[PDB]
Short mmCIF file of C-alpha atoms in Angstrom, two decimals:
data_model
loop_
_atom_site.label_atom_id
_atom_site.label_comp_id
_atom_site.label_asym_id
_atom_site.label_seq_id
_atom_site.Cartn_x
_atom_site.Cartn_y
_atom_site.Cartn_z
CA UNK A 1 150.39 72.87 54.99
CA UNK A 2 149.45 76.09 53.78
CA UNK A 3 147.27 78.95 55.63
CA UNK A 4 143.63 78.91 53.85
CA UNK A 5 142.85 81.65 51.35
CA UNK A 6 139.22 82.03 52.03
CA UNK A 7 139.30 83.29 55.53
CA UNK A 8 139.08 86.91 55.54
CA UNK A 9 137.96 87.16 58.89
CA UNK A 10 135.93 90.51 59.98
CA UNK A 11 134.71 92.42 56.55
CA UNK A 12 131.75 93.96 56.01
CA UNK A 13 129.07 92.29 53.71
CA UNK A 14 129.39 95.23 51.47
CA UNK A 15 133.33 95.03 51.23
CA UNK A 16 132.65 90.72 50.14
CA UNK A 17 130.29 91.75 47.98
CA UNK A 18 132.68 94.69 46.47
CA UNK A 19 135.76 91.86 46.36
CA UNK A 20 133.60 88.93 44.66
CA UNK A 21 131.92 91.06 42.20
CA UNK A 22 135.72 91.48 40.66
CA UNK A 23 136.77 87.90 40.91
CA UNK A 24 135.79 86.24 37.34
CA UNK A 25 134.87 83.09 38.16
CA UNK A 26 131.43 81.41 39.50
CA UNK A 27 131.94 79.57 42.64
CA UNK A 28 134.61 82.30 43.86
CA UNK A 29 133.97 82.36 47.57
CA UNK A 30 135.48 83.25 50.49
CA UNK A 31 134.11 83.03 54.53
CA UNK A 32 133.74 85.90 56.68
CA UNK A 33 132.73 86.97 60.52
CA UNK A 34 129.44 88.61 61.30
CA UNK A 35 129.58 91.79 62.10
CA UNK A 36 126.22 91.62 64.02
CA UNK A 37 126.23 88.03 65.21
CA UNK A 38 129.15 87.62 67.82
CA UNK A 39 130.96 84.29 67.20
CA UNK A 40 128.96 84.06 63.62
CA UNK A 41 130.51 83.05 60.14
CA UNK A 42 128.90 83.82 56.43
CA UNK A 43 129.91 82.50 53.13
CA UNK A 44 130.03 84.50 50.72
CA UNK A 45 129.68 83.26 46.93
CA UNK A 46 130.35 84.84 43.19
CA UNK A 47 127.57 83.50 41.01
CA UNK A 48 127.06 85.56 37.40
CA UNK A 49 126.92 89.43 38.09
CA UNK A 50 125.46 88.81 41.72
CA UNK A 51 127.35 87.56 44.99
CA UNK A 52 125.39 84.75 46.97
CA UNK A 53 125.34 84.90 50.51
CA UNK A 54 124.87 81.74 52.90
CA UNK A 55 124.89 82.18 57.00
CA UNK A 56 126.86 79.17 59.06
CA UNK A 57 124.17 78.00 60.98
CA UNK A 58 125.04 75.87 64.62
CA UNK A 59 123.02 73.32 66.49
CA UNK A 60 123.66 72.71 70.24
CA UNK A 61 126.47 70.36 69.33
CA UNK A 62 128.04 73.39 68.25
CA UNK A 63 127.89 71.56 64.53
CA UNK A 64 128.88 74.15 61.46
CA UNK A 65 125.59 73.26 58.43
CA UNK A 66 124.31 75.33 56.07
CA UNK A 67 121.52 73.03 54.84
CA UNK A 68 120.69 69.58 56.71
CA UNK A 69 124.45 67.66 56.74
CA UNK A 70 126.35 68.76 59.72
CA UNK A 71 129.87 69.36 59.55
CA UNK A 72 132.17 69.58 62.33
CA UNK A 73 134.56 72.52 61.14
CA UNK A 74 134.46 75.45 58.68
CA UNK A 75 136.92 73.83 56.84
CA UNK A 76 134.98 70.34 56.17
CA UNK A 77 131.87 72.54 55.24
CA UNK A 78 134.00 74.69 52.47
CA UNK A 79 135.48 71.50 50.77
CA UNK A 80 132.65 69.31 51.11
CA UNK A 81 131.09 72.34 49.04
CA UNK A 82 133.81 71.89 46.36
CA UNK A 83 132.42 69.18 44.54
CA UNK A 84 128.24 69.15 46.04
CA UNK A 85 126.80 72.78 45.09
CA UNK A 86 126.41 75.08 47.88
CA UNK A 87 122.87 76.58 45.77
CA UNK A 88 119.30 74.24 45.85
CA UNK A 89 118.53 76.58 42.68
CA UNK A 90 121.84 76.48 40.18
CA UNK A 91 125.18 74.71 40.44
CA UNK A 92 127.66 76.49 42.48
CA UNK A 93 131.05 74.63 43.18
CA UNK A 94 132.81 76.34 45.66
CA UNK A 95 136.47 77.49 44.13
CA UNK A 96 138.85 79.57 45.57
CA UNK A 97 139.06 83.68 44.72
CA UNK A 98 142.29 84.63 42.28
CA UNK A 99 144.43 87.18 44.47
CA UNK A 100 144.70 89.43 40.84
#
């Protein structure tokens, strides 16, 4: 049943960035909260030396997407992303970051 080790909640961009550029693996991701944005989530994703960042984007339906599918929780978006890549320009599986 297990809590979900990719929310970190309120960090700062720089602080993701700082966390993921550590973590070895491509794909290493976790989600945060906007710091500007009330109510707003980001995903945040390790790819080479460089750390990808994608905004949660609503409709009115209050829908979670980051592209065109909709999704109707954080949680469907992140493992949907598991095994489709979250990129349009390289393969990026979403896996989750190695608490080392």
């Amino acid at each position: 049943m297990k809590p979900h080790p990719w929310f970190f909640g309120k960090i700062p961009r720089a602080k993701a960035e700082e966390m993921l550029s550590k973590q070895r693996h491509d794909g290493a991701f976790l989600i945060r909260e906007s710091e500007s944005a009330p109510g707003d989530f980001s995903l945040s994703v390790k790819f080479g030396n460089d750390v990808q960042h994608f905004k949660v984007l609503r409709d009115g339906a209050g829908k979670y997407f980051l592209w065109v599918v909709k999704f109707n929780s954080l949680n469907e978006l992140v493992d949907y992303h598991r095994s489709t890549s979250v990129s349009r320009n390289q393969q990026i599986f979403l896996r989750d970051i190695e608490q080392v």
